[PDB]
Amino acid sequence: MQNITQSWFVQGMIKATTDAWLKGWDERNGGNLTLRLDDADIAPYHDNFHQQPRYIPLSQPMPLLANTPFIVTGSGKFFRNVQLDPAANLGIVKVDSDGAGYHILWGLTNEAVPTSELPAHFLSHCERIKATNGKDRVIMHCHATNLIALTYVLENDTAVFTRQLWEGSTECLVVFPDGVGILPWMVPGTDAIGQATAQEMQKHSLVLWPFHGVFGSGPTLDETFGLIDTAEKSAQVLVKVYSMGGMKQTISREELIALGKRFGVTPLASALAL
Amino acid sequence: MQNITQSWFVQGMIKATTDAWLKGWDERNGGNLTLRLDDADIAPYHDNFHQQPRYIPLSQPMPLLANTPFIVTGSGKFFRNVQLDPAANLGIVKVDSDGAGYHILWGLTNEAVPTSELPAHFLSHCERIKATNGKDRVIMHCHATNLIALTYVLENDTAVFTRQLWEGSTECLVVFPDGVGILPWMVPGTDAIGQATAQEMQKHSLVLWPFHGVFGSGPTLDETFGLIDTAEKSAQVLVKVYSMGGMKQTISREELIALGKRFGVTPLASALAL
Amino acid sequence: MQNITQSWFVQGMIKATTDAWLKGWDERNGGNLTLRLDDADIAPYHDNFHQQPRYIPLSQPMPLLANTPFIVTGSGKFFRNVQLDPAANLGIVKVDSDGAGYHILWGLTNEAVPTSELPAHFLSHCERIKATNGKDRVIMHCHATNLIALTYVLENDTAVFTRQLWEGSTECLVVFPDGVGILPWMVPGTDAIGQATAQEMQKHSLVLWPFHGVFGSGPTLDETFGLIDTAEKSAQVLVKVYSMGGMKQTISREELIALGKRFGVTPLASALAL
Amino acid sequence: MQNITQSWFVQGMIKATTDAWLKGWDERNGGNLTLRLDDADIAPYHDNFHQQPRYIPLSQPMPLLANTPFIVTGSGKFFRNVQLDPAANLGIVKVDSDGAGYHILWGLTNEAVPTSELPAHFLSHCERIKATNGKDRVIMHCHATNLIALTYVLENDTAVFTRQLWEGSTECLVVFPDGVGILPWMVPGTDAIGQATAQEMQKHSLVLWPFHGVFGSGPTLDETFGLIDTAEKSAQVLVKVYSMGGMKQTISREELIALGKRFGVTPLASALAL
Ligand SMILES: O=C(CO)CO
Ligand SMILES: O=C(CO)CO
Ligand SMILES: O=C(CO)CO
Numbered sequence A, B, C, D: 001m002q003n004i005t006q007s008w009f010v011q012g013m014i015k016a017t018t019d020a021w022l023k024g025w026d027e028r029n030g031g032n033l034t035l036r037l038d039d040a041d042i043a044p045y046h047d048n049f050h051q052q053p054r055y056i057p058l059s060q061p062m063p064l065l066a067n068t069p070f071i072v073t074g075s076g077k078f079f080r081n082v083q084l085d086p087a088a089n090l091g092i093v094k095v096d097s098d099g100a101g102y103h104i105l106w107g108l109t110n111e112a113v114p115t116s117e118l119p120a121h122f123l124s125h126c127e128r129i130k131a132t133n134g135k136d137r138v139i140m141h142c143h144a145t146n147l148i149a150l151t152y153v154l155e156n157d158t159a160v161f162t163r164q165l166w167e168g169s170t171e172c173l174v175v176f177p178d179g180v181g182i183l184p185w186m187v188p189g190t191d192a193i194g195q196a197t198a199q200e201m202q203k204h205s206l207v208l209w210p211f212h213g214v215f216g217s218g219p220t221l222d223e224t225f226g227l228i229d230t231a232e233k234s235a236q237v238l239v240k241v242y243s244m245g246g247m248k249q250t251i252s253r254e255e256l257i258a259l260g261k262r263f264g265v266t267p268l269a270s271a272l273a274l
């Protein structure tokens, strides 16, 4: 088969990271992205793999991910550079049979390793697999500018934040009816923040890290990017509105309820009750 | 003739959707676009059509559109992706002889269907055909950021909104002398919102959906995109001005009247009277 | 010689208009650009000229421009499209021997004509030729967003506007020491506004049209684009500062004087006196 | 070896300047960039050098830079144009054996000379070489929009400015734990401002020029660009927050301390003490 660089998943990783770079969401090495693949996706490209894949342990056992391949962004790597050198900035890893570690089948050249937020990513994948019966396959983190700004001015509360974001663009309730979870500020790159994020992922597809950024989950790269882009678009609208003195009118509870009924989604109750 | 992908209309659809994506007006699947063609436009490309075009009924009879071909964006499709796979994200449809349904002559692969706002689009085309003696051929919907923000702060009234937009850039009165209609918030994707939009299209080339976006109509893709871009540019200026404490000076009624006289347009009376 | 489309001047016109489109300064047909050439620039491309160049009269005699060639943008044409079809959107014109009209040597296909602001352009070229002993060769008009916004909030006065723009970026006084002239609002596309603009051009390289845009003059496309980009950058900074409650500190008169002395420019006295 | 235009350093200079142009940080000739190379980097490209390299003296002796090659942007040159003509807009210079002047080995065609901020650049390189034991190799200056805006509203004090920037994005303390030095406004392009900047560079990797821009230092083009992009991203967030009425919550001192401990950096004490 064609070279792996031309595969749908490598090309998709390039598109998502490049698009996020262009959005201004990924300065420096900010942000990280992981996509769960199937063996059938990568098997045809066996000739492109490293002859002797490097092994690295996980920070904690993840048996649910045993034998599972992922394509991931690297630690310290810049989203802006992914398009310039995919193999340097991305890696395909396959988790071993006990979920204790993984082999780097392709990429992450020059002793690069996967993103330092691997705990947040892999733990969230585990919870999203459970919550969606295996449908979700992507965890994306970026420094979405307006969402970040809003964490300094809105109450850092799931119901309040969710409700404002729903109000900021009509489509929002349909795209994220489960709302947006928000953690307290925590030191990034740790097992603790990864575990805290994964817990929020049990109930929400979006999780905010105050004064830092956002994590999103979805079935495909486009749907996950689109989820974040939707929330960030609403946030952009809100920042403008708040800068102009606040809402004089907005989407009402009754309107949100009608919207949910039409699209067959049940809105997060706490956000709806406000 | 060359492949249909290289046709002026497919290329035009790619340009408009890509440009709107770059403007930040079309996150996820937000927005939709339809362009009315003539049989002579598509006839030369018969060899590129599906051998057995799929049939889909319309939600209501539209006899005015009998036998009329259109190129359209697909339901759930992303403007960002149109350039990557035109046939997946766009379709050429031809309405049948009673205006009861249409055949998908080209595109909308993998069981895709036209935009879920087809009622708003096709009903608006009908009213614009009548209002412009067949000159208007495009209906475009996008999530124009500043216009959306303004719907939370300005009175959601045709005269007031029109007047502010005219004031926000000198060219506005010349580009949309009929003004901007504004609906109450409504659940999107319905026959009701489509009908409500089409009614506003009888009197205006621009219609706002509060907390959602805008619909525009025009004779060509460029003129329709340009119409929306003009209104959105004015809105962008207004958001800046309002964020700085409001207008200390602006275009006066007398100036708007002089402008209308020079360019041979009659400004919407209600907006002028303010 | 190579085809005229590959000439430095056609390529330069494409670059400037495309760059301005990307800046968000030229929605629809907003903006226009004219560049004065020498016969030696176009003579080598005689084979690319129309066999029978169209003649169009000027609105008033301009003997100073007798026998002078220019490359210009067309009326109703979009800056966004120049790169797609240079010959459709641009034209090379040569003013006749009495300065009464011009022939369209190249471009402006399908009966297109030069920009409707030709009076403002050609009259300003005349005054800039006189004011700079023939050094200035470009007149550029665009809808620079932040400058437009500022015309609704700052006093529409040359000294005040100049002084704020100088304060908004250190380089400004060096780039436009003569300041920025500001007209009262006037109906665009007329001989009157053209004449009023040209009068301001006797004393300034930048002229603002309130609630509309800006005109700049310079020796080359890059220097003229750069002049406007500098003023617009300062305006962008100012809009942010004003939105944050205003200046707590800024560049002082004494600092501006020192800056002028170092760079060998004499700052507009009225703006300096504030 | 391949042509020097395809070298990692010429390509890197093109990427950094083009990226900064796209960010809106380098209107006109604003900004300048210098990268310290090793002889081994340029030696393979000897065939591409000027046959008779031009000599230019430095404004003051810099013996620490004796025999050192650099690639630099030119005086009056536009970042936007670097990609179009690298040899016109960039030059490779090699400082002579007493650090009294340099030869232009490549580029800076048509009598171009290095940036007029060469004193700030070369003096800062000297201090950064000392401060980082030769690890830092880049000095970058740009007109970062939000940082500039903040200099009109925040106290122009190292501790205060540093602390706000740390608060504006979690990563900031990790990326610039030494903080951001801020000079008083000074006339640019002088030995004095160069010396003042270099002094600040002894203690900080970022230095602000009020009402003007920023200087950054780092080991590579990407790390230095990323440093500035990080500070500017935080500034962008802050401008939004301040425009919305200010922080209701933010990163606390205790959180910053925990962050520093985790990442093994010691935060600038004065900024932490606030
Ligand atoms: O975004 C990150 C990459 O540095 C970490 O949270
Ligand atoms: O914009 C839309 C596409 O989801 C619908 O109004
Ligand atoms: O900008 C213009 C083009 O329509 C006119 O002033």
Ligand SMILES: O=C(CO)CO
Residues within 6 Å of the ligand: C171, D029, D030, D031, D032, D117, D141, D188, D189
């Ligand atoms: O940015 C500069 C280039 O003009 C100088 O400080």
Ligand SMILES: [Zn+2]
Residues within 6 Å of the ligand: A030, A031, A141, A142, A143, A188, A212, A213
């Ligand atoms: Zn992060």
Ligand SMILES: [Zn+2]
Residues within 6 Å of the ligand: B030, B031, B141, B142, B143, B188, B212, B213
């Ligand atoms: Zn919509």
Ligand SMILES: [Zn+2]
Residues within 6 Å of the ligand: C030, C031, C141, C142, C143, C188, C212, C213
């Ligand atoms: Zn104009």
Ligand SMILES: [Zn+2]
Residues within 6 Å of the ligand: D030, D031, D141, D142, D143, D188, D212, D213
């Ligand atoms: Zn500078």
